[PDB]
From a paper:
We describe two genetically similar [name]-1 bnAb clonotypes from the same individual that exhibit different developmental paths toward broad neutralization activity. HA is a trimeric glycoprotein that is critical for viral entry and is composed of a globular head domain atop a more elongated stem domain. The HA head domain contains the receptor-binding site that engages sialoside receptors on host cells and is highly diverse among subtypes, whereas the stem domain carries the machinery for virus-host membrane fusion and is relatively conserved. Two HA stem-directed bnAb clonotypes, A and B, were elicited upon vaccination with H5N1 and H7N9 from a single donor (Andrews et al., 2017). Both clonotypes were encoded by germline genes [name]-1, DH3-3, and Vκ3-20 with the same CDR H3 and CDR L3 lengths.
We describe [name]-1 clonotype A, which started as a largely group 2-specific clonotype and then gained cross-reactivity to group 1 through somatic mutations. In agreement with the binding profiles of isolated clones from each clonotype, the early intermediate of clonotype A primarily recognized group 2 HA, whereas the early intermediate of clonotype B was specific to group 1 HA. Somatic mutations G100cT and S100fY on CDR H3 would stabilize the conformation of CDR H3. Specifically, mutation of Gly100c to Thr100c would help to rigidify CDR H3, whereas mutation of Ser100f to Tyr100f may acquire a π–π stacking interaction with Tyr49 of the light chain. Residues 100c and 100f are both too distant to interact directly with HA.
Numbering used by the authors:
A (entry chain H): 1 to 31, 31A, 31B, 32 to 52, 52A, 52B, 53 to 82, 82A, ...
B (entry chain L): 1 to 30, 30A, 31 to 95, 95A, 95B, 96 to 213
The structure:
Amino acid sequence: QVQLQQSGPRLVKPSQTLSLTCAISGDSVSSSSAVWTWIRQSPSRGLEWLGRTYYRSKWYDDYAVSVQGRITINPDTSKNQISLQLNSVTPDDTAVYYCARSSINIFGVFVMAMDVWGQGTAVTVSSPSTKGPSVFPLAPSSKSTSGGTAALGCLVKDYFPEPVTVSWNSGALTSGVHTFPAVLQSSGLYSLSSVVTVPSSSLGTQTYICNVNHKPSNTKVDKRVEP
Amino acid sequence: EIVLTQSPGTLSLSPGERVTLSCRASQTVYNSYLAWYQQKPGQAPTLLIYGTSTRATGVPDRFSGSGSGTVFTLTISRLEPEDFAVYFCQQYSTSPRALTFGGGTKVEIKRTVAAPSVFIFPPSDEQLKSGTASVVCLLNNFYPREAKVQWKVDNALQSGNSQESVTEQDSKDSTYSLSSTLTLSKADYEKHKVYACEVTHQGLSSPVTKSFNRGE
């Protein structure tokens, strides 16, 4: 089908340039039946349209008033992708950035309802350097597992910026997983926990590994958790 | 520039109930140009309705859109637990070329009270080698969200040295979980023996305490 694959998370220093890419599969970027758009989302301001590009015998760009003058959205037909360049960023540009397609045409007008979305790119505008996490096991006591249920986890500590991804057993274990929102420590570094409940009768026969990936620092850690 | 105002901001309703979400536009939005999206935690929004009233491909029949002019409505005929999400309206204007979203309505799922299961985790030996001790308390699968965590060290109530966070409502069982971290220096952690997390919640007949003894 149609999939939009975006850049991984980005850390950008204030006053510098954000550059993102959105690689398209299952459609042509130059399709006269498509419009390609960038939208961002922040907790403080919500969902905000940034601009669109589309090909109709020639390339067109339309940008939102809020960012006109520091935004470019360029297609690349050889890579079948669109980009986003946002200049002179400030902390107000910290957001999750989405690319999306709109193809719905009502009475000859592209009504700009977005039918396919990329996965989002978490962008942090801040001056500190990246730092990868330390990963520590959360091992349940012997007694706590005397019941039917064992709680296991990983503490993912002292990283910057967000986000981190945590999986269990390389994605094979999803039931009962809870990965919590990170908290910001007085050091300016984030700390997060991820836990899973499993049958105590498995603790001897089944291995449990938390897979931690902090893409901004290229840190990958696989921590076995043994009660 | 058309502003879309969504109401209410948050709703808490039982499965099986009818949900009515409102979107008010600061000026007329023509029918072709009003859309609705559903956004579940950690995911991009997905299109639910477009052209005011047309169900997007694959959308369950329980979702319907209506309205005109400046007042638009999204209805969920019978709420299901998986419908936990933020719902957004969106307008496109052709002249001037503009695209805006409402602020969202968060639909939370009302379920029966559920007591948390509680677990306490000592700091790992690995972390201690580094000079800091993190003690973690887990409150698993409870409802409603209100919960009290009290840390005690050698029976002294702790204050100012913990942080906590809470998951979003589970899409299946509609519960919350909460993680609290008590952070001590290694020196302080080694000065004391009994570490306890005491949990108060509507679903617990009396508070639950989980504890361990350092070194045991």
